[PDB]
Amino acid sequence: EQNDVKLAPPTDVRSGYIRLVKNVNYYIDSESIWVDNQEPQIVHFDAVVNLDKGLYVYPEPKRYARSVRQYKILNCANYHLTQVRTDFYDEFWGQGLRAAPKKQKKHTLSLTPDTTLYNAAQIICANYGEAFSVDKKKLAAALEHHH
Ligand SMILES: [Cl-]
């Protein structure tokens, strides 16, 4: 029975992180974006959640996470998004000491016009489609201008 810690997730955005959804502390880590030259159209990236409350997910019963890092793979051909791994971090922005549930299950899904990340994914793939590389500066401005 741990007490419930309320956090002050920073409203200031750390450089390199791009807000994915309007007024939500959910970001794409721009340094994570990668596409293999043998599998074009498949974008690998990490999404990062800054928490409002601490998550007690460490061996040490009193330590809590402040953020979540989710490794994902977006297929711009079919708009299938695969969730590969979820890790918990004790600092904001998916940094610091990590804790993870052991041996995790990958899970794919199809982004429909009524899906959450459909808007973001559409912006990511459109940006990627112009050069078969992501322009991080254009992506930030695209996601910012949409919001
Ligand atoms: Cl910064």
Residue numbers in the entry: 24 to 170
The paper states:
In the present study, a vaccine antigen based on the fusion of two known NTHi adhesive proteins, protein E (PE) and a pilin subunit (PilA), was developed. PE is a ubiquitous NTHi antigen described to be important for the adhesion of the bacterium to epithelial cells. It is also known to bind vitronectin, which protects the bacterium from complement attack, and immunization with a fragment of PE was shown to afford protection in a mouse model of pulmonary clearance. PilA is another ubiquitous NTHi antigen described to be a conserved protein among H. influenzae isolates. It is the major subunit of type IV pili (Tfp), which are hair-like filaments involved in adherence through ICAM-1 (25).
PE crystallized in space group C2 with a monomer in the asymmetric unit, but crystal packing revealed a head-to-tail dimer on the crystallographic 2-fold axis that had an interface area of approximately 950 Å2, as determined by the software Protein Interfaces, Surfaces and Assemblies (PISA) run within the COOT model-building tool. The PE monomer comprises a β-sheet with six antiparallel β-strands and two C-terminal α-helices, with one of these being formed by heterologous amino acids added in the PE construct used for the crystallization. A disulfide bond exists between Cys81 and Cys130, linking the main α-helix with the end of β4, which confirms the mass spectrometry data (see below). The PE crystal structure is comparable to the published structure, as revealed by their superposition. The recently published crystal structure of PE showed a noncrystallographic symmetry dimer that the authors suggest is the dimer observed in solution, despite the relatively low interface area (∼625 Å2). It was the largest interface in their crystal system, but this type of dimer has not been observed in our crystal systems. The contrasting types of PE dimers observed may simply be due to differences in crystallization conditions.
